[PDB]
Design a binder for this molecule. Structure first.
Ligand SMILES: Cn1c(CNc2ccc(C(=N)N)cc2)nc2cc(C(=O)N(CCC(=O)O)c3ccccn3)ccc21
Lengths: 219, 222
């Protein structure tokens, strides 16, 4: 089977700057009809792959002018003249010259935008969840850049360990930022042992850490 | 108006079978071959095979022979892929795709079907409001959401106001809890000025448990 090898594994580009991804086929890829069926696809998290380029150098209808494809033999290249926020995602090359048709392993393009501090929000548990015997407290860090952020839970000023989980979004296709949720989960008994619930956020965009807090039950 | 609409997420026990469907519309079904593509974490994107819709003729990627069986129903414009003797390793997103320009490219793709293979019990989610309050404001902006907790397996999909609200929505990737159940939140930022006139409802769908939950997120008086 033809092995498609992509290089680099990851790329981080400032908007307005060029991008270049390589594709190497383990053997030649000339179809029985004499054409080279080499395609490039872009896939965004949770979405289907979208067609960019076909037959090595042909750009698909509706695809921006900035994308171009080139190559011959066993070495192929996708080029973006000026990177834009909408270009984030994973780029895959694909050969359909020889059965079984095969894909490259993907190259992740990340957009190197300006620093953006997070907006911080805190949510006490709902009355419905409290009734069930559990308390989840959600801290939200919205639309920030870069990805690196430190969230610390403080309960009655005591630093917490082992009772929280965090999840980070993919980089946004419009503004190139990330969002992060950090959820502190306690039994109703443990939640009732303390009063002040706080999430302290550290990020490059902030001059000093930002604390968002509340007093349990007191509304 | 070309569309490929796949069947919903499925959860099956090891050894069982599953038949995934792909409803095609907006074109003459017999005009183009139907292809199936698997996307598994690690193995990546793999082309599984192609089906000739005119005669049901199939060409498989050798790796999937026996495992996958491709069929079609021209009368209903539906393509099917049946996976047999399911194992943990068969857990993946399966896409159907067509090419409308001979064999030049795959221009149309289905939304994908997640098939999870597990002996664990299917569990529907608990949906809790993340109410806007004085604690979830940022200079004219209010954040609100829904916490979708204790479900199995993936995926849950979240929409707001039946798909009418999409701007500023962040539906986080699921986390795996120590219990082996999943949890996620879906948040949205809106103007704090209109919390008294606008209605925000999250629509949580969990196809493996056949569950659909609509939760109205009410502003909190704190
Ligand atoms: C093997 N194969 C494929 C695979 N598709 C494919 C798409 C995209 C890609 C890719 N991604 N590069 C790679 C492969 N498409 C084919 C179309 C024909 C064909 O000529 N016709 C028209 C016949 C008439 O009307 O004269 C046809 C149409 C429907 C049923 C039967 N025959 C023959 C053979 C074909």
């Amino acid at each position: 089977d033809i092995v498609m090898t992509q290089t680099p594994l990851s790329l981080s580009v400032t908007p307005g700057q060029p991008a270049s991804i390589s594709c190497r086929s383990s053997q030649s890829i000339v179809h029985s009809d004499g054409n080279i069926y080499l395609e490039w696809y872009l896939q965004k998290p949770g979405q289907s792959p979208k067609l960019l380029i076909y037959k090595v150098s042909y750009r698909f209808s509706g695809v921006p002018d900035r994308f171009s494809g080139s190559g011959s033999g066993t070495d192929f290249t996708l080029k973006i003249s000026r990177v834009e926020a909408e270009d984030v995602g994973v780029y895959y090359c694909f050969q359909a010259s020889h059965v079984p048709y095969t894909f490259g392993q993907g190259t992740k393009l990340e957009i190197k935008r300006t620093v953006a501090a997070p907006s911080v929000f805190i949510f006490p548990p709902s009355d419905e969840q409290l009734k069930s015997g559990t308390a989840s407290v959600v801290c939200l860090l919205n639309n920030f850049y870069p990805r690196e952020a430190k969230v610390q839970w403080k309960v009655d000023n005591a630093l917490q360990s082992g009772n929280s989980q965090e999840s980070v979004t993919e980089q946004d296709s419009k503004d190139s930022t990330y969002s992060l949720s950090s959820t502190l989960t306690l039994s109703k008994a443990d939640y009732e042992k303390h009063k002040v619930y706080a999430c302290e956020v550290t990020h490059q965009g902030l001059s000093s850490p930002v604390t968002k807090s509340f007093n349990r039950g007191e509304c | 108006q070309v569309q490929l609409v796949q069947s919903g997420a499925e959860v099956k026990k090891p050894g069982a079978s599953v038949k995934v469907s792909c409803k095609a519309s907006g074109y003459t079904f017999t005009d183009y071959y139907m292809h199936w593509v698997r996307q598994a974490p690690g193995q990546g994107l793999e082309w599984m095979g192609e089906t000739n819709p005119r005669n049901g003729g199939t060409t498989y990627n050798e790796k999937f022979k026996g495992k996958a069986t491709m069929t079609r129903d021209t009368s209903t414009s539906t393509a099917y892929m049946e996976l047999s003797s399911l194992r943990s390793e068969d857990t993946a997103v399966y896409y159907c795709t067509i090419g409308t320009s001979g064999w030049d490219y795959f221009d149309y793709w289905g939304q994908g079907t997640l098939v999870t293979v597990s002996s664990a019990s299917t569990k529907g989610p608990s949906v809790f409001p993340l109410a806007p309050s004085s604690k979830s404001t940022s200079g004219g902006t209010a954040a609100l959401g829904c916490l979708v907790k204790d479900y199995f397996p993936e995926p849950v999909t979240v929409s707001w106001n039946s798909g009418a609200l999409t701007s500023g929505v962040h539906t986080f990737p699921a986390v795996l809890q120590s219990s082996g159940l999943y949890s996620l939140s879906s948040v949205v930022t809106v103007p704090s000025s209109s919390l008294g006139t606008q209605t925000y409802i999250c629509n949580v769908n969990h196809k493996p448990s056949n569950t659909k939950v609509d939760k109205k997120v009410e502003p909190k008086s704190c």
